[PDB]
Amino acid sequence: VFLGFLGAAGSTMGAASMTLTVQARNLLSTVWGIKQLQARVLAVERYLRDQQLLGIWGCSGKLICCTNVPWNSSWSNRNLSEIWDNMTWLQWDKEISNYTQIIYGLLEESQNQQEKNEQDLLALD
Amino acid sequence: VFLGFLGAAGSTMGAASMTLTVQARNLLSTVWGIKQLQARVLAVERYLRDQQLLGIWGCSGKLICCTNVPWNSSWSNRNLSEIWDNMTWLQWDKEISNYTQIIYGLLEESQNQQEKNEQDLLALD
Amino acid sequence: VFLGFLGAAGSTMGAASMTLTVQARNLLSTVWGIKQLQARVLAVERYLRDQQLLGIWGCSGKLICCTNVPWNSSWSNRNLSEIWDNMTWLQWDKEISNYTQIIYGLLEESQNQQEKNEQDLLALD
Amino acid sequence: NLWVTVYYGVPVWKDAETTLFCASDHNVWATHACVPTDPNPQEIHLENVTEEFNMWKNNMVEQMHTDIISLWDQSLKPCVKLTPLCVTLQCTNVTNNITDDMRGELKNCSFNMTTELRDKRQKVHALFYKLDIVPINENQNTSYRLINCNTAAITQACPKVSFEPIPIHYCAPAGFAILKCKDKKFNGTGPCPSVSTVQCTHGIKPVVSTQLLLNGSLAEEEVMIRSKDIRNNAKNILVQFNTPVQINCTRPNNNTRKSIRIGPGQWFYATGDIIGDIRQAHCNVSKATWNETLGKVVKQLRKHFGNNTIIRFANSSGGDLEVTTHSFNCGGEFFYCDTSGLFNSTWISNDSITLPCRIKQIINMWQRIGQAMYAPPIQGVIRCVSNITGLILTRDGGTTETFRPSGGDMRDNWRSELYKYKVVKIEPLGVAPTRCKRR
Amino acid sequence: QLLLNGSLAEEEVMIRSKDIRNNAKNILVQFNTPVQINCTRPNNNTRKSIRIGPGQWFYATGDIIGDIRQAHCNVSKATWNETLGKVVKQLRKHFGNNTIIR
Amino acid sequence: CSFNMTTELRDKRQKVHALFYKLDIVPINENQNTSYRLINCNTAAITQACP
Amino acid sequence: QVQLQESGPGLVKPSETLSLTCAVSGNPVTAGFDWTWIRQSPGKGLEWIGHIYGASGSTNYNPSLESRVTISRDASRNQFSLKLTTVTAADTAVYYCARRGGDHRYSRMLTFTFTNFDFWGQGVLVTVS
Amino acid sequence: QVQLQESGPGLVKPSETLSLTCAVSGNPVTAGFDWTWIRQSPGKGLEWIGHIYGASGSTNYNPSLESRVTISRDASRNQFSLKLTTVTAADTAVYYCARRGGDHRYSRMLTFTFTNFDFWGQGVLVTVS
Amino acid sequence: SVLTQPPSVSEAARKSVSISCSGSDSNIGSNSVSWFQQFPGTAPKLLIHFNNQRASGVSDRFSGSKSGTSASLAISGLQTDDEADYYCAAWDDSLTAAVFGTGTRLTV
Ligand SMILES: *[C@@H]1O[C@H](CO)[C@@H](O[C@@H]2O[C@H](CO)[C@@H](O[C@@H]3O[C@H](CO)[C@@H](O)[C@H](O[C@H]4O[C@H](CO)[C@@H](O)[C@H](O)[C@@H]4O)[C@@H]3O)[C@H](O)[C@H]2NC(C)=O)[C@H](O)[C@H]1NC(C)=O
Ligand SMILES: *[C@@H]1O[C@H](CO)[C@@H](O[C@@H]2O[C@H](CO)[C@@H](O)[C@H](O)[C@H]2NC(C)=O)[C@H](O)[C@H]1NC(C)=O
Ligand SMILES: *[C@@H]1O[C@H](CO)[C@@H](O)[C@H](O)[C@H]1NC(C)=O
Ligand SMILES: *[C@@H]1O[C@H](CO)[C@@H](O)[C@H](O)[C@H]1NC(C)=O
Ligand SMILES: *[C@@H]1O[C@H](CO)[C@@H](O)[C@H](O)[C@H]1NC(C)=O
Ligand SMILES: *[C@@H]1O[C@H](CO)[C@@H](O)[C@H](O)[C@H]1NC(C)=O
Ligand SMILES: *[C@@H]1O[C@H](CO)[C@@H](O)[C@H](O)[C@H]1NC(C)=O
Ligand SMILES: *[C@@H]1O[C@H](CO)[C@@H](O)[C@H](O)[C@H]1NC(C)=O
Ligand SMILES: *[C@@H]1O[C@H](CO)[C@@H](O)[C@H](O)[C@H]1NC(C)=O
Ligand SMILES: *[C@@H]1O[C@H](CO)[C@@H](O)[C@H](O)[C@H]1NC(C)=O
Ligand SMILES: *[C@@H]1O[C@H](CO)[C@@H](O)[C@H](O)[C@H]1NC(C)=O
Ligand SMILES: *[C@@H]1O[C@H](CO)[C@@H](O)[C@H](O)[C@H]1NC(C)=O
Ligand SMILES: *[C@@H]1O[C@H](CO)[C@@H](O)[C@H](O)[C@H]1NC(C)=O
Ligand SMILES: *[C@@H]1O[C@H](CO)[C@@H](O)[C@H](O)[C@H]1NC(C)=O
Ligand SMILES: *[C@@H]1O[C@H](CO)[C@@H](O)[C@H](O)[C@H]1NC(C)=O
Ligand SMILES: *[C@@H]1O[C@H](CO)[C@@H](O)[C@H](O)[C@H]1NC(C)=O
Ligand SMILES: *[C@@H]1O[C@H](CO)[C@@H](O)[C@H](O)[C@H]1NC(C)=O
Ligand SMILES: *[C@@H]1O[C@H](CO)[C@@H](O)[C@H](O)[C@H]1NC(C)=O
Ligand SMILES: *[C@@H]1O[C@H](CO)[C@@H](O)[C@H](O)[C@H]1NC(C)=O
Ligand SMILES: *[C@@H]1O[C@H](CO)[C@@H](O)[C@H](O)[C@H]1NC(C)=O
Ligand SMILES: *[C@@H]1O[C@H](CO)[C@@H](O)[C@H](O)[C@H]1NC(C)=O
Ligand SMILES: *[C@@H]1O[C@H](CO)[C@@H](O)[C@H](O)[C@H]1NC(C)=O
Ligand SMILES: *[C@@H]1O[C@H](CO)[C@@H](O)[C@H](O)[C@H]1NC(C)=O
Ligand SMILES: *[C@@H]1O[C@H](CO)[C@@H](O)[C@H](O)[C@H]1NC(C)=O
Ligand SMILES: *[C@@H]1O[C@H](CO)[C@@H](O)[C@H](O)[C@H]1NC(C)=O
Ligand SMILES: *[C@@H]1O[C@H](CO)[C@@H](O)[C@H](O)[C@H]1NC(C)=O
Ligand SMILES: *[C@@H]1O[C@H](CO)[C@@H](O)[C@H](O)[C@H]1NC(C)=O
Ligand SMILES: *[C@@H]1O[C@H](CO)[C@@H](O)[C@H](O)[C@H]1NC(C)=O
């Protein structure tokens, strides 16, 4: 599955959003028989932790997932052309690295929990 | 992520249902390099087995999931105030421990399988 | 959970599609402490790779999942009675084994990616 | 019209080779390392499933071979090493009353052995079998050495660790399954119309023997003849009996055990002496039962080699003790029995048998280089009653056919138990056309 | 001292160091052409096997057949001098165009 | 170098000779009495590489 | 008792492979005996080439010849053979097949080191030219 | 050939750290030589303090001093130095720097144990007061 | 390796002759010695094995022994039909190969 892996790394965020399955397929798989086994276990744990997050936001089973959390201009003020047409994901990740623990909290600690309780309350009616 | 973990254990089931992500985030991660590795593998397997169930019922990617399986008064006869407002999850788990292999069967062996075949038959029309 | 496992292997594909949870539950769980641990890790990795595919197609959390990929008569020309009423899954798997890397590509590399972008574009309106 | 639909949990599998784990219900085989078995194991008949089996291309046998060798090595690693025994021995004739059958079989060897103190030596004497003792020169000056001293280090087996085979169950890891062939007439290869899936195999005792298969499974209906190629004389023929032949083996000598301290907590267990007279070890089989068993074997061999063929049974051609005898572990003692009295007949289409046995204390299983095991003496009189459940035969090769016992390899004793099991990998993800379209 | 059977520089001899002005660091010089070195042990040596224990063999020199000559390595004089000329040009790029490289 | 080497039997010794390089041999004393030791014997155990 | 008979080319050219087959009458090649090849250069003494153990297929070769010698058996013909590669002038010799034998009364640990070549054939004179 | 020269404070107070630097002219401090420090108390014999191996940076110290002694080298100055902590009255001595040397014809396994201090400086008299 | 033997021996008929064999501690001093009788034009005949075991078909005139790293073949009562090349052999444990001697030509 090492075909096209990270090929879009230098591409803009828009162009690089059409290759998400290429990278996704490359995330998941005697002292020599222990250290490499630990690496395999670590890879599994890392995969599942990201899957656990995606699930905590209602983004389970999705590579592109939208929510009800507004974008705060204090995180980034760039336009949509300066993000998806004139910037790469590496540059964006560097720009937004100070806010990823805030956004994730809003994804988990505000939305989805409210959405799940609201769905629970709409289903009783 | 060990912040608030089990803090709601002594809280009522209702109050303790708003902290599901707190416990969920704490479930997933030379003889000394083997035994602890086995523990890590075991933790992964336990996580996936619960995820496998949640998926077998159509509750995948959800922390709160509703179904079409009626509650049987033979399992519990308590009201909704005596469960969600005046009881904890530890007390409930002790009360319902004799029925969890029946309910799960109804979740897997009756509903969802029927739901999936019904969806399969509605999609052909 | 080794109850009914592969019991439908000799049954027709239709009859054998009602036992998917029986096999699904049996897929997931000092040199002697390493080799068997590797087997456990391998089983987890194999499980997750199939789960990763099911997710790449929008079939996450489902045992029966329908898509928008048409069936090509060049893959098989048999009718629906000659597949679901007069054939087993072992015979079908042997018949279709030369096309599984084409169909999967259509499931990943054509549909779902288009579906996800279309959903992304319908949600902005 | 039709759309691709995916089914996960599909009862489909492919042939696969994986690592199976062991289960079991002070033993050379680590039955405490294996996981406890299920008190009520499940077997699910796979109705209308036909599966092609091949006992000669079966990774379960190679795995069992590797695991048995590993377990034996693991048992010997913490046991007393007999490094100080490679000294010149002064061996004379045993002074007890020795039957002519054993004249010269035992020698009374004196030697200078180490002690718990490195500046002190002790004079030790012990009885040794001729098979374990090699002359140093031609001159009969009593100077002898142990057979292993030129080529291998020798380690003493722990006297508290049993050599008794305990049934081992092989279990598939999750995502894999073991298929069992239930066809009573299945000859080890080809289609099997009656197949079931099991959690684990039956309990297979790790019995190691040559020529005769002991304490194995019996054929459900008829004596079975199995070979990789019945016309290729380089292959062994495994004969599975449908009735056991009882073999009564004994070591009639009432042996003692002499404990010599050779270092700090390192004890060497020597024969010491023999109480009473000295008689030859032997095995008895019923003459009539054996002859009936061979009659059945020749009928089944004629089914392959011709109805009017003269089936001759001849003895092991020769070379050395191990290849020419029926070897086995009886009560901790290693017997090497002369089976030429069993395979000495001509069958033309138209009381008891006593097998002399030799005993050896220096054991080299699986013909290893650089290592050997010393089997401590077992006190008293050894008696074993075993079931002969099959034969390992080779065809003479080069009107008549002649068969001889063969030692084969150890992937013949276990192969005769694992012949009905296959390991497959589950392929739960399938694609099929349906009329179901995604919204 | 000398790097053997490694990779060659694609274009020019490369001078690499953690800190080119810190004399406690090593300088790795990567050649763009190999210099062939022919090494030999001209003595026709025997091997004497001595058993020192049960299956434990010690392998001794034993003796030498013929005369005894010194082991040595040869390099081409011109190729080596050309290689060092390239090395000093690349070193001068770091230490000065008018520096005497010894 | 000549030396008394062990044999397959612990009660027997053999006289062995071998050539050694000067680099592997360290004098025991100044007196040129032919007594030498291997360079490693004071500080390390020596293991033979498998041929 | 046991009759051995060599058969094969009497002349091989330089750099070719010499293949000699020894037929065994009266004793299976699957027997636990060391089936050996020995050669004698003209005017010289006997040189052992190697053996194959009939009951296992394990082989042993003369260390000076090992890289150029393959020994095998064929139970369906009751034959064993020597395949000597890259023959040179030094390989001219009378080649004999033999049975190392052993003693069935002794352990393999001892009979492995026996040189009791009880049965010999007549030999094939092979000239490398 | 090789010129060593000690330089540092001639007086250190109790409980302070004594730092002496030896400049090396004519021989790199990155050479595989043991650069040593040796001291001689007034009226007493020579006492070895320790060394640093120039080609690796590995050091060895007198076990009675080791917990209070650091030896290092600086290739950019071609100097090596002694850092002696918690000085007391017993530390008054003439401190010398030396090159252990060795023999390039012998293996390190042997030249490690040489005491052939071929080159010496003149020494610094250090009074603890 | 090779086992050293006299290049030839000569003795009168009806007298005894002894053909020596000299090896090393890796063969004669470890393993047993066998002896063969080779006549010109044919394959060698085994005479003695396991140091002093006489092969079937061999007369009582032939006997032998092994001591240390040396071995010998004693031929008593020499007949004129005993003129032959006699060879010794031993298994060499350092080579893991059988080694034959140089061969001794006996004439009567
Ligand atoms: C084929 O199967 C048969 C039956 O299972 C088997 O024969 C049995 O062998 C075992 C072990 O050799 C015998 O058990 C022994 O019996 C003697 C009788 O005196 C006891 O003294 C033994 O106890 C000693 O050894 C123990 C080892 O753990 C010690 O713990 C104990 O303290 C004593 O030191 C032991 O109980 C059993 O009696 C026989 N049964 C029969 C009917 O002969 C046979 O060996 C198997 N064949 C093969 C090839 O495996
Ligand atoms: C084996 O040999 C030993 C001697 O090496 C025998 O032990 C001797 O037996 C006689 C019997 O009268 C005693 O008088 C001696 O004092 C014993 N000596 C020792 C050292 O034990 C032993 O009996 C022999 N065993 C056999 C079976 O022949
Ligand atoms: C690299 O940038 C150029 C424009 O400078 C663009 O045309 C090209 O597509 C980019 N590469 C990738 C992989 O997107
Ligand atoms: C955006 O972030 C700032 C802090 O930088 C915060 O004060 C503000 O409230 C945030 N916006 C919203 C809508 O919460
Ligand atoms: C966003 O768009 C405006 C309008 O064209 C442009 O001036 C600006 O540079 C863009 N990016 C930024 C910095 O907001
Ligand atoms: C992130 O925060 C650090 C301070 O912790 C600051 O130095 C850095 O510039 C910030 N980056 C961005 C993109 O704001
Ligand atoms: C414990 O019980 C008291 C009432 O007795 C309640 O007010 C309090 O919130 C409970 N603690 C938690 C963590 O819910
Ligand atoms: C509730 O459980 C009882 C058994 O305790 C059973 O008889 C009854 O049918 C169950 N209710 C329903 C609706 O199935
Ligand atoms: C349920 O509600 C009723 C009505 O208030 C009350 O009497 C009862 O105690 C509650 N719990 C039980 C035991 O059903
Ligand atoms: C569960 O069943 C056990 C008997 O197996 C019984 O003793 C226990 O009281 C039951 N618990 C409940 C809450 O019904
Ligand atoms: C096997 O085939 C028969 C018809 O030949 C059918 O009735 C039976 O149900 C099949 N078995 C299974 C398990 O479906
Ligand atoms: C079906 O497969 C054939 C190749 O076998 C291909 O040419 C054809 O276009 C496929 N059908 C569709 C609808 O793409
Ligand atoms: C499909 O149905 C037709 C109509 O009954 C039948 O003739 C045919 O055999 C079936 N299967 C195939 C081969 O298409
Ligand atoms: C699959 O392709 C192979 C050639 O690679 C061919 O031999 C085989 O018959 C094909 N199977 C089917 C069902 O088309
Ligand atoms: C030992 O017994 C053997 C039996 O063959 C005999 O030949 C030999 O002379 C005896 N040696 C003695 C007297 O110990
Ligand atoms: C034991 O050693 C002594 C010499 O120390 C020797 O005379 C005696 O014969 C040896 N005994 C044996 C049995 O080898
Ligand atoms: C075993 O049965 C297969 C057919 O399944 C046959 O081809 C083979 O010759 C048989 N072999 C023996 C030895 O019976
Ligand atoms: C075997 O049979 C013989 C017959 O003479 C008898 O003496 C002996 O005791 C028997 N031994 C066994 C093992 O039954
Ligand atoms: C074996 O011994 C038993 C008694 O323990 C006896 O009944 C049986 O007949 C014997 N079998 C043979 C073959 O001697
Ligand atoms: C075995 O039985 C056959 C007849 O089936 C008979 O001819 C033969 O002599 C018997 N052999 C013995 C040893 O009883
Ligand atoms: C087979 O029997 C013969 C006597 O008939 C015997 O000479 C030979 O040694 C035996 N073979 C074995 C078991 O070595
Ligand atoms: C083999 O049988 C013959 C008679 O057919 C008999 O004379 C001979 O002694 C038997 N051999 C053995 C070892 O029982
Ligand atoms: C061996 O002989 C001793 C003599 O003291 C006796 O007590 C014991 O019972 C005998 N053992 C056997 C198994 O014959
Ligand atoms: C031998 O087989 C019989 C068959 O009835 C069985 O009862 C007995 O337990 C078996 N004995 C052994 C030693 O396995
Ligand atoms: C090296 O060159 C010298 C020049 O005299 C020559 O004698 C020698 O054989 C050469 N050795 C190698 C390794 O080429
Ligand atoms: C090394 O040897 C080869 C011949 O094998 C020769 O062509 C080459 O010039 C030699 N190189 C040197 C530097 O001596
Ligand atoms: C190397 O080349 C330089 C000129 O580039 C020359 O001056 C020098 O003498 C040469 N050295 C040798 C050893 O050829
Ligand atoms: C070997 O040991 C003897 C004394 O046992 C001694 O005289 C001789 O010199 C030693 N030889 C060597 C080479 O050390």
Author numbering:
A (entry chain F), B (entry chain E), C (entry chain B): 518 to 546, 569 to 664
D (entry chain A): 33 to 57, 66 to 141, 150 to 186, 186A, 187 to 309, 312 to 321, 321A, 322 to 398, ...
E (entry chain D): 258 to 309, 312 to 321, 321A, 322 to 360
F (entry chain D): 157 to 186, 186A, 187 to 206
G (entry chain H), H (entry chain N): 1 to 35, 35A, 36 to 52, 52A, 53 to 82, 82A, 82B, 82C, ...
I (entry chain L): 2 to 9, 11 to 27, 27A, 27B, 28 to 95, 95A, 95B, 96 to 106
From the paper:
Accordingly, we generated the E275K substitution and the resulting trimer, BG505 SOSIP.v4.1 GT1.1, referred to as GT1.1, was expressed successfully in mammalian cells. Thus, GT1.1 priming followed by boosting with BG505 SOSIP or ConM SOSIP selected for at least two different CD4bs-specificities, both of which have the ability to accommodate the N276 glycan and neutralize diverse HIV-1 strains.
12C11, derived from a ConM SOSIP-boosted animal, neutralized GT1.1 ultrapotently (IC50 of <3 ng/mL), also neutralized GT1.1 N276 and ConM (IC50s of <0.03 and 1.0 μg/mL, respectively), but not BG505.T332N. Furthermore, 12C11 neutralized 6/12 viruses (50%) of a panel of heterologous tier 2 viruses (IC50s ranging from 6.3 to 50 μg/mL), as well as 6/12 (50%) of the AMP placebo panel that includes contemporaneous circulating viral strains. Compared to 21N13, nAb 12C11 targets a CD4bs epitope that is located closer to the trimer apex, yet contacts conserved CD4bs regions commonly targeted by CD4bs bnAbs, including C3 residues 365–372, loop D residues 278–281 and V5 residues 456–459. Its main epitope on gp120 is contacted by the HC (1017 Å2 BSA) and LC (294 Å2 BSA), with the LC making extensive contacts with the V3 region on the neighboring protomer (174 Å2 BSA). Unlike most VRC01-class CD4bs bnAbs that predominantly use their CDRH2 for CD4bs contacts, the CDRH3 of 12C11 accounts for 64% of HC contacts and is mainly involved in binding the C4 region. The epitope of 12C11 is characterized by CDRH1 and CDRH3 contacts with C2 and C3 (S265-T372) and the C3 and C4 regions (D368, R419-Q428). Its CDRH3 loop is involved in electrostatic contacts with D368Env and E370Env, highly conserved CD4bs residues that are required for interaction with CD4. Moreover, 12C11 accommodates the N-linked glycan at position 363 through H99HC and contacts a conserved positive charge in the form of K174Env in the V2 (~84% K/R) through Y100aHC. Due to their distance to the N276 glycan, 12C11 is likely not hindered by the N276 glycan, which might at least in part explain its breadth. The light chain of 12C11 predominantly contacts the V2 region on the main protomer, which contributes 294 Å2 BSA, and the C2 and V3 regions on an adjacent protomer contributing 174 Å2 BSA, with these contacts accounting for 37% of the total LC BSA.
